[PDB]
Amino acid sequence: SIGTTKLRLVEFSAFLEQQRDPDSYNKHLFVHIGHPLLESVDIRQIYDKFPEKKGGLKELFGKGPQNAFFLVKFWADLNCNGAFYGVTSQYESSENMTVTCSTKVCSFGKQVVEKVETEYARFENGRFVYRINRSPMCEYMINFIHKLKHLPEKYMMNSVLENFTILLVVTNRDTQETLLCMACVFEVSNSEHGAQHHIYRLVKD
Amino acid sequence: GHQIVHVRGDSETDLEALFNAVMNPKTANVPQTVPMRLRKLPDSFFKPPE
Ligand SMILES: O=C(NCc1ccc(Oc2ccccc2)cc1)c1cnc2ccccn12
Numbered sequence: 001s002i003g004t005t006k007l008r009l010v011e012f013s014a015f016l017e018q019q020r021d022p023d024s025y026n027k028h029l030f031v032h033i034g035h036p037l038l039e040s041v042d043i044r045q046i047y048d049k050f051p052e053k054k055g056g057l058k059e060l061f062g063k064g065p066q067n068a069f070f071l072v073k074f075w076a077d078l079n080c081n082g083a084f085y086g087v088t089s090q091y092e093s094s095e096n097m098t099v100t101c102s103t104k105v106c107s108f109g110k111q112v113v114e115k116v117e118t119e120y121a122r123f124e125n126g127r128f129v130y131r132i133n134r135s136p137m138c139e140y141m142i143n144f145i146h147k148l149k150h151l152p153e154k155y156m157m158n159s160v161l162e163n164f165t166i167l168l169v170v171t172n173r174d175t176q177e178t179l180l181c182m183a184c185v186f187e188v189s190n191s192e193h194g195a196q197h198h199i200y201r202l203v204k205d
Numbered sequence: 206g207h208q209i210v211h212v213r214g215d216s217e218t219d220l221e222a223l224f225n226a227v228m229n230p231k232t233a234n235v236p237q238t239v240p241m242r243l244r245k246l247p248d249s250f251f252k253p254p255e
């Protein structure tokens with residue numbers, strides 16, 4: 001799982017909702033998480049795929065805590081036909097905080113979009129829960145999926161996704177301390193069971 | 206609730222460049238890097254869970 005003793009990722013999903021008529025509803029997941037020892041990756045192998053200026057991945061990893069850093073490899077399900085493109089996530093904490101979720105859409109390692117969502121604790125089942133339900137996808141992401149699906153073969157989509165990354169940083173709004181950081185890398189799934197994923201711990205050496 | 210998004214001015218152009226890098230490799234002047242497959246990553250990075 002992705003999480004520290006300060007915050008844990010419980011669920012993540014990026015989806016496409018379609019409502020053919022008032023009696024028909026459809027939901028397609030492109031990627032999902034939350035539906036024993038993690039493998040490690042040398043963070044120096046991926047620094048170039050993420051921003052490295054004031055407030056970059058190398059900078060945030062150096063400041064730490066280093067156990068909050070994860071690299072997620074996704075195999076996105078693109079087998080899908082009014083529509084809503086959204087993202088649903090849920091975090092868990094033992095302490096009541098105000099969290100800030102930064103999602104950076106990166107192209108060639110450079111930030112292009114930044115979604116920033118301030119979320120508040122809701123005490124459910126003995127702990128604090130931070131939920132982001134149906135967060136609209138940005139126009140860059142919507143058009144990106146549309147253009148990816150438009151390619152004639154899967155190998156071509158994997159080549160384009162080679163320069164596409166997302167950096168997710170969850171921070172204590174008051175403390176400015178990194179609670180969780182997930183560097184996301186993508187490939188197109190080619191399985192009957194659809195979307196798959198692998199999670200790794202990011203390490204110094 | 207409401208969210209705040211900081212989009213870049215050349216977003217449409219950057220998205221088109223992300224695709225044109227693969228569609229025209231000798232044409233698009235995009236940054237070059239080591240292919241992920243050729244990097245020192247775990248064998249599991251390219252063998253999806255079964
Ligand atoms: O990554 C995140 N949101 C952005 C996003 C947008 C679209 C998308 O669908 C794709 C479809 C095809 C190809 C590529 C992407 C996937 C992710 C995000 C937000 N909170 C979390 C928590 C854990 C892990 C990730 N996140």
Ligand SMILES: [Cl-]
Pocket residue numbers: 087103115136137138141
């Ligand atoms: Cl998004």
